[PDB]
Nucleic acid binder design. Structure first.
Length: 183
DNA sequence: TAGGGTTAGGG
């Protein structure tokens, strides 16, 4: 079976009325749910406005994501690939972004290399192999922009990515300022 | 709209 983390989706912006039951009832329309829950406050027991649904397979998760937008209990919710508690620590881990930072690429890396690995995740909009705007020297990293934020999410939850024959690190792209605020 | 008594011992 596939890892639990990869079979689970975070569901944000849940209506105040949504319960484990109403959530399950909606998302079961795209597969077998092995888990479904609405996070509530320990004391007040009130909904925190978000939850999680987990399918028996990633194929079902993908089906659910392909079924966006999702309206549950009259409120449009925001389903996202569940990010592990560990990665949830990294800055910007939960941002809705369409661009990824690809670091550790061989100097001879060309765009076709990036396409050959990343296209399988979604429509690529822009590819930028970074160089020093002065010496023209390759800096060893690129930026790839997709059409759907879920492409980025499907990618960053994986651990390894092979580009131009060798593994590379892929994170969500932070802005010039976000980088600063994280340093 | 980021997790449910779910994260470093004791030899």
């Amino acid at each position: 079976k596939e890892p639990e983390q990869l079979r689970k989706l975070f569901i944000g912006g849940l209506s105040f009325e949504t319960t484990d039951e109403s959530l399950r009832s909606h998302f079961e329309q795209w597969g077998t749910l092995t888990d479904c829950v609405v996070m509530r406050d320990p004391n007040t027991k009130r909904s925190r406005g978000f939850g999680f649904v987990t399918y028996a397979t990633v194929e079902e998760v993908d089906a659910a994501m392909n079924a966006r937008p999702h309206k549950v209990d009259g409120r449009v919710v925001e389903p996202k690939r569940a990010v592990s508690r560990e990665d949830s620590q990294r800055p910007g881990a939960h941002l809705t972004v369409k661009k990824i930072f690809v670091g550790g690429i061989k100097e001879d890396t060309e765009e076709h290399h990036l396409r050959d690995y990343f296209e399988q995740y979604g429509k690529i909009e822009v590819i930028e192999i970074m160089t020093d705007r002065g010496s023209g020297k390759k800096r060893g990293f690129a930026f790839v922009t997709f059409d759907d934020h879920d492409s980025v999410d499907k990618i960053v939850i994986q651990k390894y990515h092979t580009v131009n024959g060798h593994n590379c690190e892929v994170r969500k792209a932070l802005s010039k300022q976000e980088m600063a605020s994280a340093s």
